[PDB]
Design a protein around this ligand. Structure first.
Ligand SMILES: Nc1ncnc2c1ncn2[C@@H]1O[C@H](CSCC[C@H](N)C(=O)O)[C@@H](O)[C@H]1O
Ligand SMILES: COn1ccc(=O)c2ccccc21
Ligand code: NA
Ligand code: NA
Length: 216
């Protein structure tokens, strides 16, 4: 299976993607304020790249990679509107990319993890480790399989995520997390087929996992 056409259509606006919330995902913004993001950052499966933009505004040199040319164009457009010189973007397949050997001190996966086939995970993890500087940190925000079923999205259980990532990184923490979005009215039916939590500020959230890891 393949989500390439759906991601490109969502970014072109066929209304904006529900996950393009216009700010970094809150669970990842909390790690930034804790000082967990360091040096040159890779925002892998960056989408519109709100987290790249926030990190570039703080002084980091950032690179965002996405398979969708529309996402890369949107990220470049927003960085240009803000006059950021520090943020760059490229179209690439996270499961098979090169050209950044030992580059990044922090790699962040903001909901890319479940957006590729299960069979692509090993190529992706090999690609990002190859792109990592010594002592690099890695952060993943991903849907929980308890919340998102088998289907187009490859959400994970805690054990599955640990088994996949521990082969490549030293895992510091895996904890429950929320993935925020702005869904249209009536999203997923009435009654709803998914557990969508209503949040303040017109947002919603779905269950997930926040993983923190590093090289060492
Ligand atoms: N193999 C792959 N390589 C790179 N990007 C991919 C990919 N498979 C999916 N993607 C991208 O993964 C992203 C998941 S949506 C999340 C986008 C962004 N990180 C955010 O938090 O808003 C989409 O932009 C999609 O195009
Ligand atoms: C790629 O998974 N995805 C697809 C449709 C959504 O509306 C959505 C909302 C939040 C996060 C991910 C999402
Ligand atoms: Na994909
Ligand atoms: Na929490």
């Amino acid at each position: 299976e393949s989500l390439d056409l759906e991601f490109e259509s969502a970014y072109r606006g066929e209304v904006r993607p529900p996950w393009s919330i216009g700010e970094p995902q809150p669970e990842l913004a909390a790690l930034i304020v804790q000082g967990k993001f360091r040096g040159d950052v890779l925002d892998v499966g960056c989408g519109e790249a709100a987290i790249s933009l926030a990190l570039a505004e703080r002084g980091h040199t950032t690179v965002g990679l996405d398979l969708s040319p529309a996402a890369v164009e949107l990220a470049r457009h927003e960085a240009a509107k803000r006059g950021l010189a520090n943020a760059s973007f490229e179209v690439a397949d996270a499961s098979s990319f090169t050209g950044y050997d030992g580059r990044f001190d922090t790699i962040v996966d903001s909901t890319l993890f479940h957006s590729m086939p299960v069979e692509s995970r090993e190529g992706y993890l090999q690609s990002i480790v190859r792109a990592a500087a010594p002592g690099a940190s890695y952060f993943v925000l991903v849907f929980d399989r308890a919340a998102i079923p088998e289907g187009p999205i490859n959400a994970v259980t805690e054990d599955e995520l640990r088994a996949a990532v521990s082969k490549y990184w030293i895992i510091d923490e895996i904890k429950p997390a929320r993935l925020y979005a702005r869904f249209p009215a009536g999203f997923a039916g009435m009654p709803a087929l998914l557990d969508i939590r209503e949040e303040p500020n017109g947002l919603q959230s779905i269950g997930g996992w926040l993983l923190s890891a590093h090289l060492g």
